[PDB]
Symmetry: D2
Subunit: 90 residues, 4 copies
Amino acid sequence: KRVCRFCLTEQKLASIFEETTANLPLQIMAITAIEVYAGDGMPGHICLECRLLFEHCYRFKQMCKRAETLLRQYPLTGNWPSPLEKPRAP
Amino acid sequence: KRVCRFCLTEQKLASIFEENPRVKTTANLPLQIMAITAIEVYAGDGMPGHICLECRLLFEHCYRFKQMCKRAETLLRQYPLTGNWPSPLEKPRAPISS
Amino acid sequence: MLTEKRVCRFCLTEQKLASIFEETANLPLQIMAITAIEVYAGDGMPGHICLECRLLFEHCYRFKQMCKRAETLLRQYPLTGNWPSPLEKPRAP
Amino acid sequence: EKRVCRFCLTEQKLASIFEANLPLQIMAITAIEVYAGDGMPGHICLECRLLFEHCYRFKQMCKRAETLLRQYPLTGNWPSPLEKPRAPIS
Ligand SMILES: [Zn+2]
Ligand SMILES: [Zn+2]
Ligand SMILES: [Zn+2]
Ligand SMILES: [Zn+2]
């Protein structure tokens, strides 16, 4: 009855909609292209492990986009960008 | 000058466009990149042509996670057709190197 | 916040603007789904969208929703034995 | 019945998805991975193919608009309004 929408566990659940640049629905869309909204008829909960993996993947996506902007702007700024912080183990 | 396109490291690089025998992967790397960043990489685009091992592992990890989330969605959407509630899924392992 | 000028974030027009945040999927979610661009109030980029860009986001999002409905109905056929009928395409605004 | 459009299920005006390339456009707009032999319909109608082209060109314009906005503080060149993509000729 109460499961994680993403891995179907019953353990360590909380609301997807319970309160970062991006809310968890935005993160889920960015990483999996799954649409979630309150009252969509699908499970409304996520386990801690799935929540932390969404946050980890989303920080990866943010780093990739920062790398892309700095590389593209390098011919305008002339400042070669230093290595970025990789997001570490969830 | 020779850096990871994604984290800008100089360490542990390989070509984005070569098969990497060190990482068991489940889809081609340009597709994995596109899924997360919407960046369409190609040989000769003028951008760094390399990726570090950790960025390759992260791309594979995000793809495996997406595949589990989609399996969960299919099983949940099919439940009203049979009334058999789907069991917890076997989670994808974090990808590791070699 | 020099980028926070009064244009459409997506086509740079000054005409027929409203807030991206003006009260299913909200427009920020649609933008993410179609372009992978993160928008939030105070992100330092333009906070407005023209009517035409808003309709194009809604049109592309309805296309994505139709593609997903087709996939769900196709994957149900081996369970139900009912072949799904053709879906209504969204028409360009 | 047998050959339908993967995306709208029509039997009309079909061609192969296979032979930007259309697989890339499909991933770019819907995050669906299609490949020959995936077990799913391998055809697309003209209208769905044109909708993918139109959504891909919109996404391209949004990306170009972001790059042009982000370079403005570095150069002082304010970008003028962009030519929106028109629905492509049949
Ligand atoms: Zn979970
Ligand atoms: Zn890297
Ligand atoms: Zn606009
Ligand atoms: Zn179609």
